[PDB]
RNA sequence: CCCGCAGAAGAAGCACCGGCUAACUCCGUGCCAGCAGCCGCGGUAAUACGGAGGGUGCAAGCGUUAAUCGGAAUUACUGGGCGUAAAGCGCACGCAGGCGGUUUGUUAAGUCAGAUGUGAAAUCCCCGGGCUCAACCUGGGAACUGCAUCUGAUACUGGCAA
RNA sequence: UAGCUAGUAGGUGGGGUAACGGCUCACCUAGGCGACGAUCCCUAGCUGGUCUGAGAGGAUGACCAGCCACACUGGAACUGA
């Protein structure tokens, strides 16, 4: 019963790619927008819209490159039933550095190398590949 | 398989049992060898397999297989029991070292004589 | 009492003493408080045959530890400086 | 400093003595969950300073009675 | 050169009304040695008649796979029909450390250093379809950066 | 702890000259060599997957005269060291002493090079050493002791080593009977018939 | 009797190489 | 440890060879002897048994047995499954327990960073050094994944309040 | 193997030990522990580490070393830091 709204965000992204759709909508949350801003900065997503006043309907717009899905392997790591907290040195490398690993740290959400650049770690949210 | 269900009841791999109940971690055992006899195998094969029902030292009474071609055993002989199943005689799960304590080695053997204890041709 | 003695390590006929700080009622190789330098009776003409942390050794003399006689000769052999 | 430790009162049916209950979030070794875990300690007090179901600041003092070596300091957020 | 390679050969049956006729399947993999591979599967009534037949279909299914001077770009999974093949890049892992029917594909691919383990079933036909699906599903650093980010050195580090 | 058998029967199983019988006559000049290696050797083998890696490993051991207990111990140090473990194995087999003497031309065979070493006739770095497994340090000197001065093999082998390739990572002084060990040998600089990658896969089974 | 009802002395049936009950998976050799 | 004294003079066995797994075809036996780890070999034309010759793999060791782990992703945390193959309580309610939409403020237990104390020594690894080289011995270091306290970040989880 | 304990959970006072304490007595209170597993049965010295394993883990912990326990069996006390 929507016990993890973050994975509800990733599922729409994953299914939107398989459905060959343009945009995906969902009820917003500040943690959801923060992750998408990391997905936008890396280029996995295409210019989100946060339209809404009292019921904020967050709208990402999917991205395709060579007639194929760009976000093809996404999964949530730190599930609400099982949370993973990596330190500075235990921070992974998705696709040997080719994929990112969104990790919420003290400064905020940032990529796994950006947390390694700042020299801090925390809750790895999702592996995007 | 629900990690919250694993903290409550852990993964438990059943311990594999030894093929031989020969007083654990004893490679060889000493026997008394009552009733040397011969039996026939299961349906694929056919022979008079020479065996003997050994009263072991520790207190068990098992049956062991006599290797080699022809033996020199009797109603009472102190033999040495080596583990090993034949999977051709029902219940035989031990071999007898030819060339041990009292059980002598085979006669006229040339190829594999460390097995069956033949020394060497002294000619 | 506390003492500063030797711990016969090494091999058969190739000894090696590690200068330890231990209680006098131990088994020469056992329970020790702090090892301080070593000694090599079969050392070469090379740079290192004997190392001693004299700052720590003089720290234990103040605490009341007694130096063994073979260890006392190494203080004389090192001449306290070089 | 002081090394205090906070826990909730599980029972107060004793004379000049209370057993407390301290929760501690332990990371499970083999798996990765941060499961919950209790702890019972016999806290000493003055008269009956804490009631039932209250959190209380405890400090490990000198050994009092048989398996009883804890003492309270404050009863913060009491029965009311 | 194209590096033909035999992997497995069986004896299937049919059971006609009289007796049974034995066809011989032959699974071969070809590959130039530069990331181009291809597997042929074909059967005939004779053993050498099928390997020649499996050479023909092998050159029809030539697939190009990127590689980093003799090895993979990143680790990759290879699920196909009960075969859970896993592959590791092994940057100078020194050797094609892989099982039977998974070695022969990666040899003729032109790959030299991998770590691999065939999980699940170890059926030769499916494990070949596992790696062929597994290798073509692997990206390239320039191929990923072409999609998003638009700078090969900026995304990598 | 040595082979002590027919030399070029080992080359017959491989099908190539392993230089362990080499004087002047190439390959028996006659009957059979680089061919049938036994009684039923005229029948061609099938060379299975294990055997291709096996005969690759056996070939290298027959070259340097290293047994399996010892060669595996070179593999331990080769694998734990940095760089390419396939390359470090041929590095440690090269630095082995009897190889170094053989590369000097001081002995005409890797077996003969052990004969000179074992019978205390070679002073490496000035010191007489009879260990055939002596891993020669880089930037070192190897030398023949005076009791082996012109003792009928040193003269005969050094003149035989004129048809060699005169290995680039070394400096032999033919006429002073003293060698000089230069840098670590480069991978591409040695024989290069050996598929070193088949060896590393065998022990990693 | 008892010296004939011994389990050795039983009618032995041979697996014929061809005909009814002749099929073998791999046989004595499997050289490929 | 060096020097000197002879004629190569004193110094090679063990298992295996149907497949797995490197390596054969001829005699003797004839579902009888026997082999075996498993699939299974032996019925008078055996590459599996017993000898011989020839090879292979190891080599002063080589095999066999016992025992642990690995292959076993066949107890799966990393790393599995449950329509039919072993496996969804017959169903529903429900305490303990597990998890939990969204916003702001705050605290700073979980979490992350740094430091200090400790994590004995020897071992396990990294450069060095010394016994003719290695095994061994040994210097320094790293590590000892941990625990506690102190000082910060405080996004996410938890607590409290609205 | 689901209830176990009655000096057992606790208080005051006396005594005792190098030292605190049901460690031991008297009186009073009636609790304490338990499904995050108490009592009971079987088995076993613990650890640094060792063997194996890609890691994670599993198994075992002889030799070297720290600690505990025991010294024909059961029990107690004296000398003495
Ligand atoms: Mg007490
Ligand atoms: Mg097809
Ligand atoms: Mg040896
Ligand atoms: Mg073969
Ligand atoms: Mg035979
Ligand atoms: Mg022979
Ligand atoms: Mg096993
Ligand atoms: Mg396992
Ligand atoms: Mg399963
Ligand atoms: Mg149902
Ligand atoms: Mg039912
Ligand atoms: Mg929440
Ligand atoms: Mg909650
Ligand atoms: Mg910390
Ligand atoms: Mg050291
Ligand atoms: Mg740490
Ligand atoms: Mg509220
Ligand atoms: Mg009192
Ligand atoms: Mg008193
Ligand atoms: Mg494993
Ligand atoms: Mg244990
Ligand atoms: Mg003992
Ligand atoms: Mg012990
Ligand atoms: Mg006694």
Could you give all domains of chain F from N- to C-terminal order, each with its CATH number?
Answer: 7-93+190-204 (1.10.1050.10), 94-180 (3.10.290.10)
Q: Is the dihedral of CA B79, B80, B81, B84 positive or negative?
A: negative
- Number of helices (H) and strands (E), helices first, in chain A? 3, 7
CA distance E107 to E3: 9
Ligand at shortest distance from the CA of D64: 1
CA distance B86 to B93: 7
CB contact under 8 A, B40 and G12: no
Name which of D24, D65, D75, D29 is nearest D44 in CA terms.
Answer: D65
Decide if F182 contacts F139 (C-beta within 8 A): yes
Binning chain G into helix, strand and coil, the percentages to the nearest 5 are: 0, 0, 100
CA distance C31 to C34: 9
Are A85 and A106 members of one domain? yes
A37 CB-near residues (< 8 Å, 6+ apart)? A48, A109
Q: State this model's resolution in angstroms.
A: 3.2
Residue A81 to chain D, least CA–CA distance (Å): 8
Ligand at shortest distance from the CA of E117: 20
B122 CB-near residues (< 8 Å, 6+ apart)? none
Decide if A17 contacts A69 (C-beta within 8 A): yes
Are E18 and E88 members of one domain? no
Decide if F64 contacts F93 (C-beta within 8 A): yes
Domain at B115, CATH number = 2.40.50.140
Are E49 and E111 members of one domain? no
Decide if A29 contacts A8 (C-beta within 8 A): no
φ, ψ of residue B63 in degrees (nearest 5): -115, 135
Scanning the structure block, which residue is given the tokens 């990371």?
D27
Are A54 and A101 members of one domain? no
Ligand at shortest distance from the CA of B112: 5
- Chains near A with 3+ CB pairs less than 8 A apart are B, D, E
Residue ending a domain, among E45, E63, E81, is: E63
Angle between helices C54-63 and C69-78 (to 10 degrees): 130
- Residue D46: C-alpha distances to residues D25, D49, D72 (Å): 30, 7, 9
Burial of F89 (0-12, 13-18, 19+ CB in 10 A): buried
Decide if E55 contacts E39 (C-beta within 8 A): no
Binning chain F into helix, strand and coil, the percentages to the nearest 5 are: 40, 10, 50
Decide if F94 contacts F190 (C-beta within 8 A): yes
Are E78 and E35 members of one domain? no
Residue numbers of the domain that contains E46: 3-63
Burial of D68 (0-12, 13-18, 19+ CB in 10 A): middle
Burial of G25 (0-12, 13-18, 19+ CB in 10 A): exposed
H51 C1' closest Cα residue = B110
For chain E, what is the domain count?
A: 2
Those of residues 82-141 in E touching chain F at CB distance below 8 A are: 92, 94-97, 100, 103, 112
Domain at A37, CATH number = 3.30.1370.30
Decide if E138 contacts E111 (C-beta within 8 A): no
Q: Nearest nucleotide, C1' to the C-alpha of D38?
A: I36
CA distance F181 to F174: 14
Are E85 and E129 members of one domain? yes
Residue numbers of the domain that contains A35: 5-69
For chain C, what is the domain count?
A: 1
Are E119 and E49 members of one domain? no
Residue ending a domain, among A69, A88, A110, is: A69
**Rounded to 5 degrees, what angle do the CA atoms E78, E84, E89 make?**
50
- Residue E39: C-alpha distances to residues A81, C48, E133 (Å): 44, 66, 11
For chain A, what is the domain count?
A: 2
Chains C+A touching (3+ CB pairs under 8 Å): no
- Chains near D with 3+ CB pairs less than 8 A apart are A, B
> What tokens does F93 get?
């087999």
Name which of F157, F202, F199, F163 is nearest F177 in CA terms.
Answer: F157
CA distance E29 to E39: 4
> What tokens does G17 get?
């190489």
Integer Rg of chain B from CA: 20
Which residues does G contribute to its contact with B (CB < 8 Å)?
7-8, 12
**How many Cβ pairs closer than 8 A exist between chain E and F?**
19
For chain B, what is the domain count?
A: 1
CA distance F64 to F75: 14
Residue numbers of the domain that contains C43: 1-81
Domain at E48, CATH number = 3.30.160.20
CA distance B103 to B68: 11
Q: Taking the domains of chain D in order of start, what are their residue ranges?
A: 3-79
CB contact under 8 A, G7 and B40: yes
Domain at A103, CATH number = 3.30.1490.10
Decide if F102 contacts F172 (C-beta within 8 A): no
Are E75 and E122 members of one domain? yes
Distance from Cα D71 to the centre of ligand 21, integer Å:
37
**How many Cβ pairs closer than 8 A exist between chain B and D?**
10
CA distance F161 to F173: 12
Long-range contacts formed by F33-40: CB under 8 A, 24+ apart: F33/F8, F36/F12, F37/F9, F37/F12, F37/F13, F38/F12, F38/F13
A 10 A CB-CB count for D6 gives: 13
Scanning the structure block, which residue is given the tokens 């499916």?
E126
Decide if F8 contacts F36 (C-beta within 8 A): no
- Number of helices (H) and strands (E), helices first, in chain D? 0, 7
Are E28 and E45 members of one domain? yes
Are E92 and E42 members of one domain? no
CB contact under 8 A, D28 and B7: yes
Strand, helix or coil for residue A34: helix
Are E70 and E31 members of one domain? no
Asked whether residue E32 is assigned to any structural domain, the reply reads yes
Residue numbers of the domain that contains B55: 1-123
């Amino acid at each position: 019963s929507m016990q993890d709204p973050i994975a509800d965000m990733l599922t729409r992204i994953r299914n939107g790619q398989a459905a060959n759709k343009a945009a995906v909508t969902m009820p917003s949350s500040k943690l959801k927008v923060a992750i998408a801003n990391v997905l936008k900065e890396e280029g996995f997503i295409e210019d989100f819209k946060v339209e809404g006043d009292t019921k904020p309907e967050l709208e990402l717009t999917l991205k395709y490159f060579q007639g194929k899905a760009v976000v093809e392997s996404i999964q949530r790591v730190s599930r609400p039933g099982l949370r993973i907290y990596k330190r500075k040195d235990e921070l992974p490398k998705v696709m040997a550095g080719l994929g990112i690993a969104v990790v919420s740290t003290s400064k905020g959400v940032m990529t796994d190398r950006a947390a390694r650049q700042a020299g801090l770690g925390g809750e790895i949210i999702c592996y995007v590949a | 398989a629900t990690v919250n269900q694993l903290v409550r009841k852990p993964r438990a791999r059943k311990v594999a049992k030894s093929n031989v109940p020969a007083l654990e971690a004893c490679p060889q055992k000493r026997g008394v060898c009552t009733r040397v006899y011969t039996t026939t195998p299961k349906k694929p094969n056919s022979a008079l397999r020479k065996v003997c029902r050994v009263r072991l030292t520790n207190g068990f009474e098992v049956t062991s297989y006599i290797g080699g071609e022809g033996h020199n055993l009797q109603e009472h002989s102190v033999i040495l029991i080596r583990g090993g199943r034949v999977k051709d005689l029902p219940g035989v799960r031990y071999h007898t070292v030819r060339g041990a304590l009292d059980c002598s080695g085979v006669k006229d053997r040339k190829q594999a004589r460390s097995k069956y204890g033949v020394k060497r041709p002294k000619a | 009492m506390v003492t500063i003695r030797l711990a016969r390590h090494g091999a058969k006929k190739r000894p090696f003493y590690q200068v330890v700080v231990a209680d006098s009622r131990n088994a020469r190789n056992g329970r020790f408080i702090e090892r301080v330098g070593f000694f090599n009776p079969i050392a070469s003409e090379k740079e290192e045959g004997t190392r001693l942390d004299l700052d720590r050794i003089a720290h234990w003399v103040g605490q009341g530890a007694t130096i063994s006689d073979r260890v006392a000769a190494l203080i004389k052999e090192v001449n306290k400086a070089a | 400093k002081i090394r205090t430790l906070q826990g909730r009162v599980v029972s107060d049916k004793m004379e000049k003595s209370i057993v407390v209950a301290i929760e501690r979030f332990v990371k499970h070794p083999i798996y990765g969950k941060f499961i919950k875990r209790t702890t019972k300690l016999h806290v000493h007090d003055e008269n009956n300073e804490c009631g039932i179901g209250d959190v209380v600041e405890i400090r490990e003092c000198r050994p009092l009675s048989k398996t009883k070596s804890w003492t309270l300091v404050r009863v913060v957020e009491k029965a009311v | 050169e194209l590096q033909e390679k035999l992997i497995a050969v069986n004896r299937v049956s049919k059971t006609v009304k009289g007796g049974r006729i034995f066809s011989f399947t032959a699974l071969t993999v070809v590959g130039d040695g530069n990331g181009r591979v291809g597997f042929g599967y074909g059967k005939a009534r004779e053993v050498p008649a099928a390997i020649q037949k499996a050479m023909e279909k092998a050159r029809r299914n030539m697939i190009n796979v990127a590689l980093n001077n003799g090895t993979l770009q990143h680790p990759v999974k290879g699920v196909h029909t009960g075969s859970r093949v896993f592959m590791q890049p092994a940057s100078e892992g020194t050797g094609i450390i892989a099982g039977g029917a998974m070695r022969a594909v990666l040899e003729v691919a032109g790959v030299h250093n991998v770590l691999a383990k065939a999980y699940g079933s170890t059926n030769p036909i499916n494990v070949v379809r596992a790696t062929i699906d597994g290798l073509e599903n692997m990206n390239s650093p320039e191929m990923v950066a072409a999609k998003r980010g638009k700078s090969v050195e900026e995304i990598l580090g | 702890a040595r082979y002590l058998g027919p030399k070029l029967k080992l080359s017959r199983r491989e099908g190539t000259d392993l230089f362990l019988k080499s004087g002047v006559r190439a390959i028996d000049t006659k009957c059979k060599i680089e061919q049938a290696p036994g009684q039923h050797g005229a029948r061609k083998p099938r060379l299975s997957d294990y055997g291709v890696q096996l005969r690759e490993k056996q070939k290298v051991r027959r070259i340097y005269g290293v047994l399996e207990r010892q060669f595996r111990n070179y593999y331990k140090e080769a694998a734990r060291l940095k760089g390419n473990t396939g390359e470090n194995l041929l590095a440690l087999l090269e630095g082995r002493l009897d190889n170094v003497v053989y590369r000097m031309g001081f002995g005409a065979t890797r077996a003969e090079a052990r004969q000179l070493v074992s019978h205390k006739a070679i002073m490496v770095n000035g010191r007489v050493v009879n260990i055939a497994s002596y891993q020669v340090s880089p930037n070192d000197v190897v030398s023949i002791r005076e009791k082996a001065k012109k003792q009928s093999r040193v003269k005969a082998a050094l003149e035989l080593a004129e048809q060699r390739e005169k290995p680039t990572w070394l400096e032999v002084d033919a006429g002073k009977m003293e060698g000089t060990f230069k840098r670590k040998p480069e991978r591409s600089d040695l024989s290069a018939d050996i598929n070193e990658h088949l060896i590393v896969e065998l022990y990693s089974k | 009797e008892a010296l004939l009802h011994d389990p050795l002395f039983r009618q032995r049936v041979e697996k014929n190489k061809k005909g009814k009950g002749s099929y073998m998976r791999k046989g004595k050799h499997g050289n490929r």
